[PDB]
């Protein structure tokens, strides 16, 4: 996060850290959606142009963290994955279309003050909150600069109008994507960055007071560059693939 602030304790209890066993290192963020299921960007697991092809055995999931590098004894829960599923039509060759993956935990995690799931939008939530102008929140332990936080950072950012998103890049934007950020004129900054990838873009429902994950930090061009924006996977448009894997 570039231009973010320190998260407060228990502000994002659904935030997960994707961690590499050896060499031990922060891979990406993810979010807890239930006691056994974690959601993240597919490019965190599989990205052939960079020789990235991570297996289940290769990682850990860390829940309830605040500190980026400390082992938060008695607070944090570290788990092992039972299974990884990537979207069958994920596009790593052209634009990262369908950048989404589910992780099945080898065993359920217990809820607590610091560990708690986020809601998945249903058609009417998405219809109402996914509006140009409406702010969402991104959290993560990534780079502070296009620079490593000591603690979980946060930033609130506006969703931008489809056309402005298209016009900012040469990359082919699909319907499973949405971009968010400040216009260079709005004179406000902030953005995901190296390490944040795969984390959540959440909004709070004005109707029931619940937090909903609307996007997944997917890609960008630099970090907090003027006139460029962050691209996020549209969780609702991929909602049936989600239900499907969980239910089968």
């Amino acid at each position: 996060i570039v231009e973010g602030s320190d998260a407060e304790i228990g502000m994002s209890p659904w935030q997960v850290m994707l961690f590499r066993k050896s060499p031990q290192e922060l891979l990406c963020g993810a979010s807890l959606i239930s006691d056994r299921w974690v959601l993240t960007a597919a490019h965190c697991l599989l990205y052939p142009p960079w020789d990235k092809n991570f297996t289940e055995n290769d990682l850990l999931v860390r829940i309830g963290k605040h500190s980026r590098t400390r082992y938060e004894r008695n607070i944090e829960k570290i788990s092992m994955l039972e299974k990884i599923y990537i979207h069958p039509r994920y596009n790593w060759r052209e634009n990262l279309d369908r950048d989404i993956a589910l992780m099945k935990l080898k065993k359920p995690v217990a809820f607590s003050d610091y560990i708690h799931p986020v809601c998945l939008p249903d058609r009417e939530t998405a219809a109402s909150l996914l509006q140009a102008g409406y702010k969402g929140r991104v959290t993560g332990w990534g780079n502070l600069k296009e620079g490593q936080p000591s603690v979980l950072q946060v930033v609130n950012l506006p969703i931008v109008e489809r056309p402005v998103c298209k016009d900012s890049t040469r990359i082919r934007i699909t319907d499973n994507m949405f971009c968010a950020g400040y216009k260079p004129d709005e004179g406000k900054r902030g953005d995901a960055c190296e390490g944040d990838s795969g984390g959540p873009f959440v909004m709070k429902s004005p109707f029931n007071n619940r937090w909903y994950q609307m996007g997944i930090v997917s890609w960008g061009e630099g970090c907090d560059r003027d006139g460029k924006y962050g691209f996020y996977t549209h969780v609702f448009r991929l909602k049936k693939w989600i239900q499907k894997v969980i239910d089968q």
Partner: peptide, 10 residues
Amino acid sequence: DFEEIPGEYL
């Protein structure tokens, strides 16, 4: 920079 984690976890 990462502090050591319990071995049970590997």
